[PDB]
Design an enzyme around this catalytic site. Structure first.
Site, PDB file in Angstrom:
ATOM      1  N   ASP A 174       1.019  -1.137  -0.021  1.00  0.00           N
ATOM      2  CA  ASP A 174      -0.126   0.051  -0.250  1.00  0.00           C
ATOM      3  C   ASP A 174       0.845   1.397  -0.051  1.00  0.00           C
ATOM      4  O   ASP A 174       1.043   1.956   0.878  1.00  0.00           O
ATOM      5  CB  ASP A 174      -0.865  -0.045   1.187  1.00  0.00           C
ATOM      6  CG  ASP A 174      -1.824   1.136   1.159  1.00  0.00           C
ATOM      7  OD1 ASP A 174      -2.039   1.997   0.284  1.00  0.00           O
ATOM      8  OD2 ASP A 174      -2.765   1.095   2.296  1.00  0.00           O
ATOM      9  N   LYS A 217       0.318   3.945  -2.223  1.00  0.00           N
ATOM     10  CA  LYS A 217      -0.345   5.314  -2.565  1.00  0.00           C
ATOM     11  C   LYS A 217       0.450   5.861  -3.668  1.00  0.00           C
ATOM     12  O   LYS A 217       0.583   7.096  -3.567  1.00  0.00           O
ATOM     13  CB  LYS A 217      -0.639   6.080  -1.551  1.00  0.00           C
ATOM     14  CG  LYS A 217      -1.343   5.474  -0.075  1.00  0.00           C
ATOM     15  CD  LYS A 217      -2.791   5.204  -0.553  1.00  0.00           C
ATOM     16  CE  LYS A 217      -3.641   5.186   0.608  1.00  0.00           C
ATOM     17  NZ  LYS A 217      -3.240   3.962   1.622  1.00  0.00           N
ATOM     18  N   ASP A 235       3.424   9.764  -8.107  1.00  0.00           N
ATOM     19  CA  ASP A 235       4.147  10.459  -8.933  1.00  0.00           C
ATOM     20  C   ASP A 235       4.048  10.652 -10.282  1.00  0.00           C
ATOM     21  O   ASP A 235       2.924  10.270 -10.741  1.00  0.00           O
ATOM     22  CB  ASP A 235       5.598  10.071  -8.498  1.00  0.00           C
ATOM     23  CG  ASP A 235       6.520  11.053  -8.030  1.00  0.00           C
ATOM     24  OD1 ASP A 235       6.805  11.775  -9.077  1.00  0.00           O
ATOM     25  OD2 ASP A 235       7.131  10.977  -7.062  1.00  0.00           O
ATOM     26  N   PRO A 287       4.800   9.564 -14.389  1.00  0.00           N
ATOM     27  CA  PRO A 287       4.942   8.312 -15.059  1.00  0.00           C
ATOM     28  C   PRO A 287       6.454   7.745 -14.806  1.00  0.00           C
ATOM     29  O   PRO A 287       6.532   6.544 -14.214  1.00  0.00           O
ATOM     30  CB  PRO A 287       4.728   8.525 -16.402  1.00  0.00           C
ATOM     31  CG  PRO A 287       3.536   9.576 -16.190  1.00  0.00           C
ATOM     32  CD  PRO A 287       4.081  10.595 -15.132  1.00  0.00           C
TER      33      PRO A 287
HETATM   34  O1  UP6 Z   1      -8.900   5.185   2.155  1.00  0.00           O
HETATM   35  C1  UP6 Z   1      -8.155   4.445   2.636  1.00  0.00           C
HETATM   36  C2  UP6 Z   1      -6.751   4.144   1.993  1.00  0.00           C
HETATM   37  N1  UP6 Z   1      -5.931   3.325   2.705  1.00  0.00           N
HETATM   38  N2  UP6 Z   1      -6.234   3.096   4.198  1.00  0.00           N
HETATM   39  C3  UP6 Z   1      -5.245   2.290   4.635  1.00  0.00           C
HETATM   40  O2  UP6 Z   1      -5.882   1.201   4.993  1.00  0.00           O
HETATM   41  C4  UP6 Z   1      -5.265   1.024   6.550  1.00  0.00           C
HETATM   42  C5  UP6 Z   1      -6.533   1.017   7.413  1.00  0.00           C
HETATM   43  O3  UP6 Z   1      -5.852   0.629   8.711  1.00  0.00           O
HETATM   44  P1  UP6 Z   1      -6.888   0.647  10.116  1.00  0.00           P
HETATM   45  O4  UP6 Z   1      -7.913  -0.722  10.031  1.00  0.00           O
HETATM   46  O5  UP6 Z   1      -5.697   0.683  11.265  1.00  0.00           O
HETATM   47  O6  UP6 Z   1      -7.502   2.076  10.245  1.00  0.00           O
HETATM   48  C6  UP6 Z   1      -3.881   1.807   6.712  1.00  0.00           C
HETATM   49  O7  UP6 Z   1      -2.878   1.178   6.281  1.00  0.00           O
HETATM   50  C7  UP6 Z   1      -4.374   2.928   5.808  1.00  0.00           C
HETATM   51  O8  UP6 Z   1      -3.042   3.644   5.448  1.00  0.00           O
HETATM   52  C8  UP6 Z   1      -7.183   3.747   4.587  1.00  0.00           C
HETATM   53  O9  UP6 Z   1      -7.442   3.546   5.877  1.00  0.00           O
HETATM   54  N3  UP6 Z   1      -7.911   4.486   3.943  1.00  0.00           N
HETATM   55  O1  UP6 Z   2       5.218  17.643 -10.253  1.00  0.00           O
HETATM   56  C1  UP6 Z   2       6.202  17.051 -10.230  1.00  0.00           C
HETATM   57  C2  UP6 Z   2       6.426  16.471  -8.824  1.00  0.00           C
HETATM   58  N1  UP6 Z   2       7.620  15.835  -8.396  1.00  0.00           N
HETATM   59  N2  UP6 Z   2       8.759  15.298  -9.479  1.00  0.00           N
HETATM   60  C3  UP6 Z   2       9.849  14.859  -9.230  1.00  0.00           C
HETATM   61  O2  UP6 Z   2      10.833  15.677  -9.422  1.00  0.00           O
HETATM   62  C4  UP6 Z   2      11.813  14.895 -10.165  1.00  0.00           C
HETATM   63  C5  UP6 Z   2      12.188  15.461 -11.470  1.00  0.00           C
HETATM   64  O3  UP6 Z   2      13.169  14.927 -12.052  1.00  0.00           O
HETATM   65  P1  UP6 Z   2      13.627  15.055 -13.445  1.00  0.00           P
HETATM   66  O4  UP6 Z   2      14.822  16.412 -13.603  1.00  0.00           O
HETATM   67  O5  UP6 Z   2      14.693  13.759 -13.792  1.00  0.00           O
HETATM   68  O6  UP6 Z   2      12.399  15.192 -14.451  1.00  0.00           O
HETATM   69  C6  UP6 Z   2      11.520  13.398  -9.805  1.00  0.00           C
HETATM   70  O7  UP6 Z   2      12.019  13.081  -8.766  1.00  0.00           O
HETATM   71  C7  UP6 Z   2       9.992  13.455  -9.859  1.00  0.00           C
HETATM   72  O8  UP6 Z   2       9.307  12.341  -9.201  1.00  0.00           O
HETATM   73  C8  UP6 Z   2       8.188  16.085 -10.803  1.00  0.00           C
HETATM   74  O9  UP6 Z   2       8.902  15.649 -11.790  1.00  0.00           O
HETATM   75  N3  UP6 Z   2       7.048  16.535 -11.047  1.00  0.00           N
END
Ligand code: UP6
Ligand code: UP6
Lengths: 217, 218
Positions: free
Chosen positions: A62, A64, A67, A69
């Site tokens: 998990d 999430k 970032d 692509p």
């Molecule tokens: O909408 C979301 C998405 N992900 N989680 C994740 O699911 C788990 C929920 O755990 P809990 O039963 O201890 O609340 C945690 O790892 C949390 O980051 C949520 O709670 N809500």
């Molecule tokens: O809107 C955003 C937010 N974060 N990054 C991050 O910034 C860096 C950009 O690197 P680059 O100079 O190699 O494109 C990478 O770590 C990327 O995850 C983006 O490129 N755009």
């Protein structure tokens, strides 16, 4: 995906000893563990291989993923290299960012779970209004695994309606956040449970109780 | 606000400890601020932050784009600051409570939160762009002082600067590989983030020097 007892353990403890011990105590009730950043950033990604070695369980990362692509691909590659079977990705950043994850999952034999709506209060500000469109985007992209909120059963039900009965849907928010196991399973294939289990005085009894309440399903 | 040398932050996204350390060392004379993300952390562990601090005199910004529920966000921030990160980048789209959770940990642990209000990749147009102005406004209301905005979208970056005011600190990625121009971006951002244009160059030091040469007057 076949999840034992339709119950996925959200192992968010941040100590390796406690995480391994608690998971071991409830191992007879599960075969799927959701590992997130709290544990991975505290003990390292090698913990994933340790879980597979000790429990022979399925691992859903998990993370999430949210970032660009290029970075998403790197994140997925590192995650699957560590042994994760699937990874949870945010849909809010757009189709290209989701596609990047789908590409790596296909190359390494893994699955992508698209998180369409979150269940905490703040999700109502921006995520909820984009949730249906994000779900449709998932369908268009060929996504078959989704994550929806137990805290809002009407929203979880809508998500199920959009993706269809064939898609796989897991749902967090059960227990600690108020979601009901049985009601959540009316729409989701499996429930995710964290604190109500790992913070319980007796984790095994906690898990057993939850399963008992849904034994009819 | 942090004093970023040459207004240039290195996005160290190599996924090998040896290469990451070598390249960072090659540009240390030009940069004292390094952004470390999940590509490197998930490949080498959080202890990589310790290695960078030991080897170089560089501040560390953890680009983890925190986007979980409040409780999980707190745990992520605690683990990240425990490892030595000076700051952490958090997503604002999950809402005020999720950002507040990060600010609370940063305050208690004496570190900083950078709020990512908008991204610069193509997919950002779908949902992020339309929510960006409000997310930025939310950050200001929450007391956020550090922000991240897109170099690839000058019009959007300019609006972000207006919303957060001149006192707020703003850093911007998307320079180089993604098409953003160093000078143009610095019209609004305090510092630019550069990754591939530097770490994939035959001589990262020469690449860094060239970028700095183009913004000498700035
Ligand atoms: O909408 C979301 C998405 N992900 N989680 C994740 O699911 C788990 C929920 O755990 P809990 O039963 O201890 O609340 C945690 O790892 C949390 O980051 C949520 O709670 N809500
Ligand atoms: O809107 C955003 C937010 N974060 N990054 C991050 O910034 C860096 C950009 O690197 P680059 O100079 O190699 O494109 C990478 O770590 C990327 O995850 C983006 O490129 N755009």
């Amino acid at each position: 995906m076949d999840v034992m007892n339709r119950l996925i353990l959200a192992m968010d403890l941040m100590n390796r000893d406690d995480a391994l011990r608690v998971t071991g105590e409830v191992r007879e009730y599960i075969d799927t563990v959701k590992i997130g950043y709290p544990l991975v950033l505290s003990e390292g990604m090698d913990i994933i291989a340790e879980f597979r070695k000790r429990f022979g369980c399925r691992i859903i990362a998990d993370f999430k993923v949210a970032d660009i692509p290029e970075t998403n691909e790197k994140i997925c590659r590192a995650t699957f290299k560590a042994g994760a079977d699937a990874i949870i990705v945010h849909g809010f950043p757009g189709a290209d960012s989701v596609r990047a994850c789908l590409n790596v999952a296909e190359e390494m034999g893994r699955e992508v779970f698209l998180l369409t709506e979150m269940g905490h209060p703040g999700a109502e500000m921006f995520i909820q209004g984009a949730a249906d469109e994000i779900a449709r985007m998932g369908v268009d992209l060929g996504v078959k695994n989704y994550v929806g909120p137990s805290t809002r059963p009407e929203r979880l039900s809508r998500l199920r309606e959009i993706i269809g009965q064939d898609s796989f849907l897991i749902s967090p928010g059960v227990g600690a956040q108020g979601g009901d196991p049985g009601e959540t399973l009316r729409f989701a294939d499996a429930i995710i449970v964290g604190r109500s289990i790992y913070l319980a005085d007796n984790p095994a009894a906690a898990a057993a109780g939850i399963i008992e309440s849904i034994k009819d399903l």
